[PDB]
Amino acid sequence: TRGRVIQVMGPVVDVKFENGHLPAIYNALKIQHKARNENEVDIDLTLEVALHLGDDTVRTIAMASTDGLIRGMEVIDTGAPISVPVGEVTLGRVFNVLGEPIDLEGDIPADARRDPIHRPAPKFEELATEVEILETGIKVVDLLAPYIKGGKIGLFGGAGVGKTVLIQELIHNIAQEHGGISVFAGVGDRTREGNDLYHEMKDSGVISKTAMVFGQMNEPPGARMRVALTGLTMAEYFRDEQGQDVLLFIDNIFRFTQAGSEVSALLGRMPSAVGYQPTLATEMGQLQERITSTAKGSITSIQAIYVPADDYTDPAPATTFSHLDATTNLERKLAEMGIYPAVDPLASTSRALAPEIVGEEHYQVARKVQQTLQRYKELQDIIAILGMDELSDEDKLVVHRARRIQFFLSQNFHVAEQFTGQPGSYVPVKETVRGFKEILEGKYDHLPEDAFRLVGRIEEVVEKAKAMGV
Amino acid sequence: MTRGRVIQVMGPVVDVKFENGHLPAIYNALKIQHKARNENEVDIDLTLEVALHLGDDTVRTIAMASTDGLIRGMEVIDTGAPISVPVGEVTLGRVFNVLGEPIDLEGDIPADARRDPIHRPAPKFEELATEVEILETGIKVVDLLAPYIKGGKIGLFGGAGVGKTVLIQELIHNIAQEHGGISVFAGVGDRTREGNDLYHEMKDSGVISKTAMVFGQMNEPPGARMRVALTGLTMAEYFRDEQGQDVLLFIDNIFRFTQAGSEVSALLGRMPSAVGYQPTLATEMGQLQERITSTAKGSITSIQAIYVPADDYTDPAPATTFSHLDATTNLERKLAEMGIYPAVDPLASTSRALAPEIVGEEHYQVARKVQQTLQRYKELQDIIAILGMDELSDEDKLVVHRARRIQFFLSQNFHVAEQFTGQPGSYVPVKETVRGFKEILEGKYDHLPEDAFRLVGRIEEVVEKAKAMGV
Amino acid sequence: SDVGTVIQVGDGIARAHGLDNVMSGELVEFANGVMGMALNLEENNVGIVILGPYTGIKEGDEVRRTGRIMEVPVGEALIGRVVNPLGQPVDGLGPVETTETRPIESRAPGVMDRRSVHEPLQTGIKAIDALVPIGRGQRELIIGDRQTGKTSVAIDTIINQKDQNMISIYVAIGQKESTVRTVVETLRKHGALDYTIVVTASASQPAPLLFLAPYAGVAMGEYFMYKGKHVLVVYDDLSKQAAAYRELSLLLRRPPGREAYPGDIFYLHSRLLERAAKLSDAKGGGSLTALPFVETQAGDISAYIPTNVISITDGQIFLQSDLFFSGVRPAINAGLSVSRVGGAAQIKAMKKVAGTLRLDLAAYRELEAFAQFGSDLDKATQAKLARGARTVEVLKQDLHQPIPVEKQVLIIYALTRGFLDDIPVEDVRRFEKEFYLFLDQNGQHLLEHIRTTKDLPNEDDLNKAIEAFKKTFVVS
């Protein structure tokens, strides 16, 4: 009971299994062939099943390029979904979508258990709703949009704003804070960044308690689509057996939505909206709903999103926005201003900025900060085109402190070691919230604004000025 | 058995069923001769061009004249070759239909004449030449901002009603008298009125002796409209190769070739593209345009017009043909409504001949500095609509001041205009053009009223108008 | 068996019966003698895109199977010639002795094999080399409207590679064949054509030859990179390649998508654009930087081809038509152009001056966007508006006159440190002209230290040099 290939149309293939032996949907298939003659080409290729057709035939998608496929090749049926090896063995390694290790360190044995990629989501009975503030050590995120365990978190931006630099600073700070497993998925990631990140994590020695999944842009669209679910199935083993908080990072899900749109067009369905497939909310929900806090522990996730043209009504961002618990917006104007990670104080929102979850002082502090920056945002054009001396002395006070606040949300970073070389550091929550209480009190208003860039404490700001001698 | 039968008709398209082993090649031609056998039928002589095979010996064909009357089981003959045009010395002074038969009442072409295929491969990279120099033509804007190229493709782009044919007629009045070379004028998508008006214009000036002409018309079925462009080009090709004279080619409207393809493609049976066009837009349009080339053997200069389907240039058929043209003129409706003629877009006119080597430094500096003032004037038009003129200062006041005058002084009284309006026309030398626009940019004549600069030839004529208005 | 009969011949495509053992992307040869690239292996008939002229083929003809797969000729012999994507000479000058052949389609280098991009690709274009830097191995889009400056920037790149080793290539897709001739003679006149290959597919060519042109160009580039020499590939318009794919797929009856582009387009371009690399010292230290171009329709954005390519490439340059007609040349918008690799690629001297220049120009871009309409502003803003206006005027440049990096850093340094306040905005393009002559009449040691050290000279002597020139130069 092995199938035979009967059409090829690029990524799509058709296989005519003998009836009585048809695979399920989302099942997996192997081609291994060695060429009989000189003209032929040796092939090792896997396919996934995507819908059934009229008689015996099944319509499938290919995870490696179909070049060299004859008609009438034998297809092996695995009888199961794409199976990913799960265990502690995967700590430190880099994998492809099918679970083979890309790095040359070694090969996972056949004897180990492997878990299916596709599994039903958490039920209504099993789910729970704990609330705890996740101390990330990033001065904007901890002050103005506090992250929470158990939940989907979102980073929205254009291109080249800091999304990957920031995701690296997260992975490093969490590896210092806890020996909690991390899984990183580069879904449709440029093969260049994969080299940068693998060597940065090997050279800072952060990789001992992490795993990595990659699918590059030069992969078929189906292989770009299924890479996020491999990362899910790995993080799910660590929660269910080890029972501890296991972060899942996804490098950009915009490529994932587009890979689904291209697969639907190859399957011959009819577009909608700006050409996205019909089943946009379904597929994305299927992914996003597994990220949860059931009774064993957590799988809190931090994801980044490309917003094509600074208009957020495009289907992929708009469909994503409902699922996310807390979202911070990255704007290129601040990144080019050289204050980092570029996150807008006014446009960032979270569920967790309420006194019952975060804390009484934290609520009063954050709302004073945002009111100060909002009053600065409406005062700059008068400052530009009337004389700056015309601003009232109370508004002049709001100006002076808004300058300091805007700079002191910048922070010196371990990931800057590659780009600029400086050491950086980590800030616990208490020191962020107190330092901003120091900023808002105003006794330190004598120290100059230039000092406040790229620092981790108000004592560091005193030191930098001290070098300047202030 | 080389005779066939029509099996299906579908308008312009017809489907023949030749017996096995005698299928014609693509682009061959087929003849219909049918005796009107009974009191019900209509006699016809029609010829068909093969455009696809479709298996089981069927071939799909485009008719070259209206299909009213055809019957299932009626016979079709095979010529054996492409639509064959009679060419040589005797062509000059004659007017042909698309098939190569004369319609001019003068007579019929001797049967001994060599007749040639219309479909042949384009000239190769080793054969071309690039020695580039100005086709100086006296049209004030085209002599300044987008100088036309001797031996180069020239393009006129505009919407319906903006002024393309008046510009072509001024070009024939200025160039075709002095060129000293064979001119071919082909009408594709042409009004029959303009065809008669031209034939009388050419006889009244005697110019008809050297030139030859091919016509199709708006009332023709699409296949004829497509294959007129190719029949005209085959004539110009023979004269520049065998005789070696410089040749001038005019095509009246080349968009109608692509549109006729759009009509007949969906019936042929191939899926739409970006706005209903056939799939093979750029390959077949490029195939035609890559033949019209100035090899070393002898130069062609060719002046074309393209109707933008609406006032939208982002449409596929204008978009594919903007690449192929060395010098392009954009005619825009908004200027024409202001009464500025010819309505030439100063900012969007592009030509390879602009380059300090080709025009010289004095002429270059002026083309760019004039485009710079008009582009700043577009920016000021918005802010003056909010704040008013009273709020601008210095460099913004003088741009609106000089951009009005320059925008009017690019308008000229054509020698062909004397029928639409009582006026006499002009011819302006390049030197008077470059001095004139320099003098306006310097501001020597800033005191003259902006009314005076409209529809004028030289700055001396503007001073004379302004004197009569009381300066 | 492996001989088959043709049963359609329309439109530049065919269909055939038989050919049981056929493979996707195989070559099959017609009785006429031209050959085709099998591209849909459907249930009972093979789709066969036809290379060369198709007019001779008729139904009932026979196709034989070549057994080979698509391969390109490669050697040192090609350098200095103009060649067809199938590999034939089209320039005169006779045949080329290509020692061996490489496949058109093959796997790219893995994630481990590459290294970080750390050495520059100096272009000579002041606004790029300062504000949007390129490093060897980087892939960067230039996207703009028609007649804005895509090919002039490409040619300035190929012309500047005389001074630093680069086996550059240039691929022309769909072009008017007389424009290709004007380009080739421009490369010959500037003395630059003997270290580069030019590949031409003209507009007349049948559809598959437009489609396969960048795949064969990169197949030529990567051989030199495997030897270990730096390489540069330029694709003169990728959008025309995408259109050739659309027309080819629509004739093959494949389910369409947005616009009508077939759904495979993003994969097809990623197969092209991810072969570019910077191989490790274990693999030889080579490079293959690539510069694709896309022509956008009317300032269109968020369209299908531009968003695909903008997602793939590690940076993008956006050219503006309304900038060009306002006198900035080559027109480059600093606001919308980004380089993810930037900062690392630059020389250390450039890193100091170009980093601050980005800050200055971003700050004035916003202040001018609103406050220029009002006549009079705050003093500090009138100063920042003056510095921005001088910055854009000092970044204007001529055509086919690359400026060496040594004299770029010295003009940008003169700009940022504010030595140009005394001089008027109109006179600056003459301040540059008279200064670079002075800098070759005096200051050769400064340039020599920068040439090999990559390092900014001592600030005392640099200021002494600029102050002396400001004694010589005469203000209008």
Ligand SMILES: Nc1ncnc2c1ncn2[C@@H]1O[C@H](COP(=O)(O)OP(=O)(O)OP(=O)(O)O)[C@@H](O)[C@H]1O
């Ligand atoms: N130089 C000119 N001087 C005066 N009037 C002009 C001039 N050019 C064009 N016109 C006027 O504008 C119109 C131009 O008519 P024309 O035959 O050029 O239309 P068209 O653009 O050729 O149409 P189509 O695209 O269908 O061929 C007429 O009303 C004509 O009188």
Ligand SMILES: Nc1ncnc2c1ncn2[C@@H]1O[C@H](COP(=O)(O)OP(=O)(O)OP(=O)(O)O)[C@@H](O)[C@H]1O
């Ligand atoms: N740096 C420059 N300074 C002045 N003019 C320039 C410059 N670069 C290009 N140009 C001008 O650009 C025009 C042609 O542009 P170019 O030859 O680059 O075509 P393009 O804009 O790339 O469009 P296409 O891709 O269709 O060729 C000419 O007028 C040329 O002088």
Ligand SMILES: Nc1ncnc2c1ncn2[C@@H]1O[C@H](COP(=O)(O)OP(=O)(O)O)[C@@H](O)[C@H]1O
């Ligand atoms: N702290 C920092 N110091 C210096 N440069 C930085 C810093 N953060 C970001 N950058 C620069 O900005 C770039 C941002 O690009 P990135 O967000 O990594 O792109 P992508 O998200 O597409 O991978 C970095 O590659 C680097 O060049």
Ligand SMILES: [Mg+2]
């Ligand atoms: Mg990224």
Ligand SMILES: [Mg+2]
């Ligand atoms: Mg007309």
Ligand SMILES: [Mg+2]
């Ligand atoms: Mg070009």
